[PDB]
Amino acid sequence: SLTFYPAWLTVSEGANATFTCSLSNWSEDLMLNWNRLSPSNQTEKQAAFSNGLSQPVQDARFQIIQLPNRHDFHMNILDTRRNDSGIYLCGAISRHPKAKIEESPGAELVVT
Amino acid sequence: LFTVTAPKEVYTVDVGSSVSLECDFDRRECTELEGIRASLQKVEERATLLEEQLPLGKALFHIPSVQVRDSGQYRCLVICGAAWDYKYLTVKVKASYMRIDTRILEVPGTGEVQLTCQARGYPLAEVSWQNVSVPANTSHIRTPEGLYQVTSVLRLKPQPSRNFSCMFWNAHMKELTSAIIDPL
């Protein structure tokens, strides 16, 4: 299972924002994505963490860091903008055959 | 870099018809054919992956004969080596309340009649009665097919030479169906 905390986060524009995605059991075969819900409530990929590396989809301000406890990850937005405000979630799947997607609950960012 | 898009997000489909669900990905991003896999995972094995479409950048899932229980939200997922993405697709299955059975029961000694409309469909219908001054009582059960059987009962003294209409409103489908009862 995954959690994504804090469920509600407010920061002032220009500050960094950090959510934590906590997995009940991370392992090396998992690929961890950070998504946002779009204005049509569709999931849209922001960044991914796989093979120990964070890769942003379209904005390099979005990066994922694995914590020393292995099972938690920081999803960081550097230098927040107003329009970063919205609902985000994390999701994981194994590279192993027949794996099922798991998603966290949504968490809300409000940039002031 | 790797993402999945969905050209069409909501599929409205009638029970008994076919549907093909699709999400797409750019093969110029996912260049390595050997590492491509796709899955349609319901949010909660009827849909068949047409895997010859994967080299074309398309994850296509075919349901040849749709049932009510195919309705719901799905994650359309593609894995490209060590990256993946997904989109939500919504299947809205419709079974129209097209067959409305009607019944008339005379109530001894009152000059009143009990009128019934009963129909099966999906999702749940609400029932109104046109231009009457008495409230109706409507109930439902679910059938094993996943349809709702909705029954509405109205008791009144019929104004001579009036017909009575019961209207089934299927909100998700913006559909109205109706039956006209002539108590003569």
Structural domains of chain B in order of their starting residue, each with its CATH number: 1-96 (2.60.40.10), 97-184 (2.60.40.10)
CA angle B88, A24, B78 (to 5 degrees): 30
Q: Do A101 and B41 touch (CB under 8 A)?
A: yes
Query: How far, CA to CA in Å, does A39 sit from each of A4, A79, B84?
Result: 20, 22, 22
Residue A77 φ then ψ, to 5°: -105, 115
Contact B178, B166 (CB under 8 A): yes
How far does A10 lie from chain B, in Å, by closest CA? 27
Disruptive mutation site among A27, A28, A30, A31 for chain B (greatest number of B CBs within 10 Å): A31
Q: Identify which of A31, A100, A101 has the shortest CB distance to residue B83.
A: A31
Residue A37 is encoded by which pair of tokens? 């819900």
Question: In this structure, which topology does domain A1-112 adopt according to CATH?
Answer: Immunoglobulin-like (2.60.40)
The whole-angstrom separation of Cα A91 and Cα A97 is 17
Strand extents, DSSP E, chain B: 4-5, 10-14, 19-25, 36-42, 48-49, 58-63, 72-80, 83-94, 100-107, 112-121, 126-129, 137-142, 148-156, 164-170, 175-181
Provide the sign of the torsion angle of the four alpha carbons A96, B56, B8, B92, taken in this order: negative
Q: Do A57 and B41 touch (CB under 8 A)?
A: no
Q: Which residues on A lie below 8 Å from B45 (Cβ)?
A: none
Experimental method: X-ray
The residue in chain B having the minimum alpha-carbon distance to the alpha carbon of residue A103 is: B43
- Give strand pairing partners of A14: none
Q: Which residues on A lie below 8 Å from B37 (Cβ)?
A: 97
The whole-angstrom separation of Cα B68 and Cα B152 is 23
**Single-letter code of the amino acid located at B130:** Q
Q: Identify which of A43, A48, A91 has the shortest CB distance to residue B83.
A: A48
